[PDB]
Amino acid sequence: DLLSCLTFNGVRNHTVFSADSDSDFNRFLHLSIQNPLFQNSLISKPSAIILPGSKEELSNTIRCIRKGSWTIRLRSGGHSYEGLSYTSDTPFILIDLMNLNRVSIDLESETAWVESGSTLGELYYAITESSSKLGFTAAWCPTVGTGGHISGGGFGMMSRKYGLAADNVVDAILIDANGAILDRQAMGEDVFWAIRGGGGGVWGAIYAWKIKLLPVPEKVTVFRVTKNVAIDEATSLLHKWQFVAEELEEDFTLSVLGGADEKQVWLTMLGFHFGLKTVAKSTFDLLFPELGLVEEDYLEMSWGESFAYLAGLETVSQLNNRFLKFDERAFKTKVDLTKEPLPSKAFYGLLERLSKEPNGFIALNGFGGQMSKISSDFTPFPHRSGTRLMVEYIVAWNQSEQKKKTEFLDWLEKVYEFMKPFVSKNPRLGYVNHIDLDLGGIDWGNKTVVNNAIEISRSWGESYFLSNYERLIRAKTLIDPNNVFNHPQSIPPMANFD
Numbered sequence: 001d002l003l004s005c006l007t008f009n010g011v012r013n014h015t016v017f018s019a020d021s022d023s024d025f026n027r028f029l030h031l032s033i034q035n036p037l038f039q040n041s042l043i044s045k046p047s048a049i050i051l052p053g054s055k056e057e058l059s060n061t062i063r064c065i066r067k068g069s070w071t072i073r074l075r076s077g078g079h080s081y082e083g084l085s086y087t088s089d090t091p092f093i094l095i096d097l098m099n100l101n102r103v104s105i106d107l108e109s110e111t112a113w114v115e116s117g118s119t120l121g122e123l124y125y126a127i128t129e130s131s132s133k134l135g136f137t138a139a140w141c142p143t144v145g146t147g148g149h150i151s152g153g154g155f156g157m158m159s160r161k162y163g164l165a166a167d168n169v170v171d172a173i174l175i176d177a178n179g180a181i182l183d184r185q186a187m188g189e190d191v192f193w194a195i196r197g198g199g200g201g202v203w204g205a206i207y208a209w210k211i212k213l214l215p216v217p218e219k220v221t222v223f224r225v226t227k228n229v230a231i232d233e234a235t236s237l238l239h240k241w242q243f244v245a246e247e248l249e250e251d252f253t254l255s256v257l258g259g260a261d262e263k264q265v266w267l268t269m270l271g272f273h274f275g276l277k278t279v280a281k282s283t284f285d286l287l288f289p290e291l292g293l294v295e296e297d298y299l300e301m302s303w304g305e306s307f308a309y310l311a312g313l314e315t316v317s318q319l320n321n322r323f324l325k326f327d328e329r330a331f332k333t334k335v336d337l338t339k340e341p342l343p344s345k346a347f348y349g350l351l352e353r354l355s356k357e358p359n360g361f362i363a364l365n366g367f368g369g370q371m372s373k374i375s376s377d378f379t380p381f382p383h384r385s386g387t388r389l390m391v392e393y394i395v396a397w398n399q400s401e402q403k404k405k406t407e408f409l410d411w412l413e414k415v416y417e418f419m420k421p422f423v424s425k426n427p428r429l430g431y432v433n434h435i436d437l438d439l440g441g442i443d444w445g446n447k448t449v450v451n452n453a454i455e456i457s458r459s460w461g462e463s464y465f466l467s468n469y470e471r472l473i474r475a476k477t478l479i480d481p482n483n484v485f486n487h488p489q490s491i492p493p494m495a496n497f498d
């Protein structure tokens with residue numbers, strides 16, 4: 001009996017399933033569902049939700065669930081694009097880590113211990129409250145949890161300078177399938193490597209990350225300028241942007257959010273500079289005069305204030321609120337990574353289809369900088385030198401447009417088909433934090449599939465990790481040979497050991 005086991009093991013914060021919309025269960029369940037595509041009355045629901053309040057409670061929670069027949073699901077921020085943190089094709093128990101959100105900062109070693117329920121915003125806020133000369137590289141989305149984010153890499157506006165979030169992890173507490181509490185020394189370098197980008201929900205439950213805090217100026221510079229132009233000018237802006245974005249010095253980042261709310265397009269250029277406005281403006285006057293950036297556009301502020309700004313927030317304090325939803329639309333998204341420059345016709349066609357769909361968006365980021373200097377096998381994220389751009393295709397819709405779902409999905413699929421010849425090939429690359437099930441999936445309940453799991457999973461595995469896929473399988477076998485931690489695209493162990 002799970003409730004008996006949990007009670008005896010001192011795990012008191014738990015709620016069983018209830019169909020009552022007003023129950024604590026239903027509220028907790030939906031509190032961290034960040035993609036409404038997976039909220040509806042259909043879709044798998046957990047038999048119980050458990051909120052461990054300590055690493056020991058997390059350890060025993062894992063032990064208890066497993067004594068039953070249940071599949072374990074871990075949820076930090078709940079931002080899984082495919083809702084893999086709170087859904088399962090088999091009966092499951094949901095471990096919600098929201099009560100594990102403590103940040104301990106050591107200003108002397110300039111490191112920090114971060115409980116895996118902590119959101120990026122909670123982390124950013126905690127850093128500012130301790131220092132104005134320190135920051136950390138990760139996503140702009142403040143409600144994204146460190147649990148899944150760092151586990152899958154973690155790309156952000158400072159990654160051209162400092163690489164991924166996972167690239168700056170120096171230790172971690174990992175709790176395995178037996179509840180064993182392990183640090184870097186205990187888990188070994190192969191497992192410690194795998195958790196730094198190998199994908200969440202595969203290796204065990206990360207209790208906490210030990211991260212290196214990174215030097216930032218007292219004042220940095222950001223700007224957000226939107227250009228409402230025609231497809232023809234937009235195409236030329238984007239065709240030049242790709243070179244600027246990648247070629248910029250590592251102290252710079254220029255990102256693009258694109259949409260066509262009509263059949264003209266809008267382009268929002270987002271810029272960041274580790275320094276003051278004069279060096280920032282001088283650089284873009286030179287490299288990108290077409291943006292029409294003036295002195296008034298360059299805003300100086302603290303690092304924390306900049307990330308609050310880039311997140312579309314008003315104050316630094318709003319970073320420390322994990323339940324703040326500025327958007328609440330269902331969505332599906334895909335991503336490409338490029339090796340060769342995109343011809344002008346690539347952007348043209350992309351914007352063309354964008355105009356045909358007002359609920360469609362794109363997000364564009366250049367790599368280069370330090371992303372080119374980090375070895376491809378430093379951590380599981382393989383897309384380093386030779387990788388030019390990350391291109392995200394998104395379609396999102398509210399509760400009014402629900403019936404147009406299959407329409408929206410057909411659009412995205414065709415956008416993706418169109419971009420096929422211009423982006424990476426053999427294999428077509430992906431990013432594990434941009435988990436995409438269109439690429440396929442494993443049924444761990446089908447014994448035929450499971451026995452050939454490695455070669456079946458090699459499809460998406462090499463797309464996410466390339467040649468790092470092989471080492472990940474070994475690390476999986478070291479830490480979870482019986483595959484207690486699994487989902488449709490989780491790394492398979494060396495064989496079926498059950």
Ligand SMILES: *Cc1cc2c(nc3c(=O)[nH]c(=O)nc-3n2C[C@H](O)[C@H](O)[C@H](O)COP(=O)(O)OP(=O)(O)OC[C@H]2O[C@@H](n3cnc4c(N)ncnc43)[C@H](O)[C@@H]2O)c(*)c1C
Pocket residue numbers: 034073074075076077078079080081084085086097116117138139140141143144145146147148149151152153154155156199200201202204205206207433434487
């Ligand atoms: C919603 C959202 C996602 C974003 C955004 N912007 C991003 C960006 O600028 N850069 C990025 O690199 N990624 C961005 N993403 C995507 C997120 O990076 C991913 O969606 C993260 O994986 C989200 O992490 P989290 O919020 O924790 O997602 P969950 O659904 O809770 O978990 C995902 C996955 O990880 C496993 N897992 C969670 N917690 C743990 C622990 N402690 N240990 C092991 N495994 C864990 C889950 O089981 C699940 O499988 C911008 C926005 C708005």
Ligand SMILES: *[C@@H]1O[C@H](CO)[C@@H](O[C@@H]2O[C@H](CO)[C@@H](O)[C@H](O)[C@H]2NC(C)=O)[C@H](O)[C@H]1NC(C)=O
Pocket residue numbers: 012013014031051099
């Ligand atoms: C289980 O954990 C939740 C989350 O921390 C607890 O809920 C919080 O309770 C405090 C005060 O009791 C409120 O200020 C918070 O707003 C609550 N959070 C949420 C998300 O509702 C809950 O009390 C815990 N339950 C038990 C039995 O320990």
Ligand SMILES: *[C@@H]1O[C@H](CO)[C@@H](O)[C@H](O)[C@H]1NC(C)=O
Pocket residue numbers: 446447448449
């Ligand atoms: C199990 O998987 C194999 C291969 O994917 C398939 O041929 C078989 O029909 C599946 N079994 C069931 C019951 O679906």
